[PDB]
């Protein structure tokens, strides 16, 4: 059979149609479809303002930039995340303060966050990992208590809910429209916020810092209507798309009961899982093989897998900048985690092909 990648975008007739209307219109860059997408995300989350951007990385950049973060400022973040967050902190001239995460949910804890707080802390950046939400009640309380803004990394959390409310409903959250995200337009993102002054700054910084004329220099991070229209078509399918992911995640849960591999633990609080990823831990002790070996073997069997992620602080630049930094739970998982196939268009043929491969390598 053909290669089974660990993810595929759910592109259909709606996506192609959306593009066609934009191309035929002549207005292919930022315009009406961007306004519609922003208005739509406000309706999805329950928030008041939304700013569409070229990527969630870009969203993180202008979000932190809008806060005036720079020299001498600290930003608390997990090491277990995508390198984008760490890079934007550094490139702004600020100091990344990496903290550890829960050993089984891979989510940053209020404990580890609070212990790292200093008068130089200008932001706390939690990650709604794999689609599951973090402990926002506790983390928000830390923010209001110490007076530190909270910028939520919701790159995995489109459709995620935390204690009855959508992620992005309150505060500030940054979603991703990357190829493998729940909804996609190849590359894109959106910042949702409740602060009108903050939103105006984002809107400015994403487009040359114009109002027109330059008021304060900004970057070019605007999302074309070409892509926005695709993200809109996807957003209409969101509940359906996530339902498929959820259904498949359930089937994984069953098969894993008779497998040595350890899926992530669900958060203890009320939530709705967007199921962007299905991560398993591969401990050589109880599995008989290393995670690297498993990924190489699955590949031989024509099955793709992901690595989300190898901790940022174990990568070259951050190894050399923070030699002393130790994060045991982060490091433990980082050496053992990998992402199994999970995408809306995945079939039972595809699913059973994975489990058959997993039993074959185990034993």
Ligand X SMILES: Cc1ncc(COP(=O)(O)O)c(CN[C@H]2CO[C@H](OP(=O)(O)OP(=O)(O)OC[C@H]3O[C@@H](n4ccc(=O)[nH]c4=O)[C@H](O)[C@@H]3O)[C@H](O)[C@H]2O)c1O
Q: Which residues bind its own copies (CB under 8 A)?
A: 8-9, 11, 15-16, 19-20, 23-24, 26-29, 54-55, 57-58, 61, 83-84, 86-87, 90-91, 178-179, 184-187, 208-210, 213-220, 222, 224-227, 230, 310, 312, 315-318
Give the residue with the Cβ less far from ligand X, 5 or 260: 5
**Nearest approach, Cβ of residue 262 and its own copies (Å):** 25
> Distance between terminal CA atoms of the chain?
25
Minimum CB separation of residue 216 from its own copies in Å reads 6
Smallest distance, its own copies to C-beta of residue 223, A: 8
**From its own copies, ligand X, none, interface partner of 325 (C-beta below 5 to 8 A by class):** none
Residue 38: CB minimum distance to its own copies, A: 17
Nearest-approach distance from CB 142 to ligand X, in angstroms: 20
Shortest separation between residue 363's beta carbon and ligand X, angstroms: 28
Q: Tell the smallest beta-carbon distance from residue 347 to ligand X (Å).
A: 15
Q: Which does 304 bind (CB under 5 to 8 A by kind): ligand X, its own copies, none?
A: ligand X
Torsion over CA: 34, 39, 44, 46 (sign): positive
Minimum distance, C-beta of residue 161 to its own copies, in the bound complex (Å): 27
Q: Which does 218 bind (CB under 5 to 8 A by kind): ligand X, its own copies, none?
A: its own copies
The entry of ligand X, its own copies, none near residue 306 (CB within 5 to 8 angstroms by kind) is ligand X
Residue number with CB closer to its own copies (140 or 219): 219
Of 156, 162, 177, 146, nearest to 40 by C-alpha is 177
Nearer to its own copies, 144 or 316 (CB): 316
Cβ closest to its own copies, residue 105 vs residue 222? 222
Distance, in Å, from the CA atom of 312 to the CA atom of 82, rounded to the nearest integer, reads 7
Q: Which is nearer to ligand X, 120 or 214 (CB)?
A: 214
Retrieve residue 4's tokens: 């089974």
CB of 31 to its own copies, least distance (A): 9
For 67, 94, 243, the CA distances from 123, given in Å and listed in that order, are 8, 11, 33
CA distance 18 to 40: 16
Cβ nearer to ligand X, comparing 154 with 358: 154
The alpha-carbon radius of gyration of the chain (Å, integer) is 20
Query: Is the distance from CB of 306 to CB of 7 less than 8 angstroms?
Result: yes
Whether 141 and 113 have beta carbons less than 8 Å apart is answered as no
The candidate with the shortest Cα–Cα distance to 125, out of 93, 180, 86, 156, is: 86
Q: Which does 86 bind (CB under 5 to 8 A by kind): its own copies, ligand X, none?
A: its own copies
Q: Which of 54, 98, 7 is nearest to 314 (CA)?
A: 98
Which of 25, 120 has the CB closer to ligand X?
25
Exposure of 153 by Cβ count < 10 A (0-12 exposed, 13-18 middle, 19+ buried)? buried
Interacting partner of 249 out of its own copies, ligand X, none (Cβ under 5 to 8 A depending on kind): none
Closest CB to ligand X among residues 179, 238: 179
User: Is it true that the peptide bond before 309 is cis, omega within 30 degrees of 0?
Assistant: yes
Contact positions toward ligand X, by CB under 6 A? 5-9, 26-29, 55-57, 81-82, 84-85, 127, 153, 155-156, 176, 178-180, 189, 220, 304, 306, 308
| Residue 31: exposure state from Cβ atoms within 10 A (0-12, 13-18, ≥19) | middle
Per the structure block, which two tokens stand in for 232?
Answer: 């809109």
Closest by Cα among 297, 251, 249 to 273: 249
Between 56 and 148, name the residue whose CB sits nearer to ligand X. 56
Nearest to 11 by CA among 241, 319, 207: 241
């Amino acid at each position: 059979s053909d290669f089974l990648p660990f993810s595929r975008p759910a592109m259909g007739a709606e996506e192609l149609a959306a593009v066609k209307t934009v191309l035929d219109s002549g207005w292919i860059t930022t315009g009406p479809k961007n306004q519609e997408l922003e208005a739509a995300f406000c309706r999805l989350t329950g928030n008041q303002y939304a700013v569409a951007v070229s990527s969630a990385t870009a969203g993180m950049h202008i979000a932190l930039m809008a806060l005036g973060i720079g020299e001498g400022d600290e930003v608390i973040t997990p090491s277990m995340t995508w390198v984008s967050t760490l890079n934007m902190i550094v490139l702004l001239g600020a100091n990344p303060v990496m903290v550890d995460v829960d050993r089984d949910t891979l989510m940053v804890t209020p404990e580890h966050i609070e212990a790292a707080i200093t008068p130089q802390t200008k932001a706390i950046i939690p990650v709604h990992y794999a689609g599951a939400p973090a402990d926002l009640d506790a983390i928000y309380a830390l923010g209001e208590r110490y007076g530190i803004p909270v910028i939520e990394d919701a790159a995995h959390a489109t459709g995620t809910s935390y204690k009855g409310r959508h992620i992005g409903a309150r505060g500030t959250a940054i979603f991703s429209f990357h190829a493998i995200a729940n909804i996609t337009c190849a590359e894109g993102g959106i910042v949702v916020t409740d602060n009108p002054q903050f939103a105006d700054k984002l809107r400015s910084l994403k487009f040359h810092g114009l109002g027109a004329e330059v008021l304060a220099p900004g970057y070019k991070y605007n999302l074309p209507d070409l892509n926005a229209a695709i993200a809109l078509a996807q957003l209409q399918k969101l509940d359906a798309l996530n339902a498929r992911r959820a259904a498949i995640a359930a089937q994984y849960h069953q098969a894993m009961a008779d497998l040595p591999f350890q899926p992530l633990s669900l958060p203890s609080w009320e939530h709705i899982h967007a199921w962007h990823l299905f991560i398993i831990r591969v401990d050589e002790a109880r599995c008989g093989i290393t995670r690297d070996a498993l990924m190489a073997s699955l590949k031989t069997k024509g099955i793709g897998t992901g690595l989300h992620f190898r901790a940022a602080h174990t990568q070259k630049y951050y190894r050399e900048r923070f030699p002393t930094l130790t994060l045991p739970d982060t490091e433990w998982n980082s050496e053992r985690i990998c992402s199994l196939p999970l995408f809306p268009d995945m079939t039972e043929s595809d699913f059973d092909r994975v489990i058959t491969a997993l039993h074959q390598i185990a034993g």
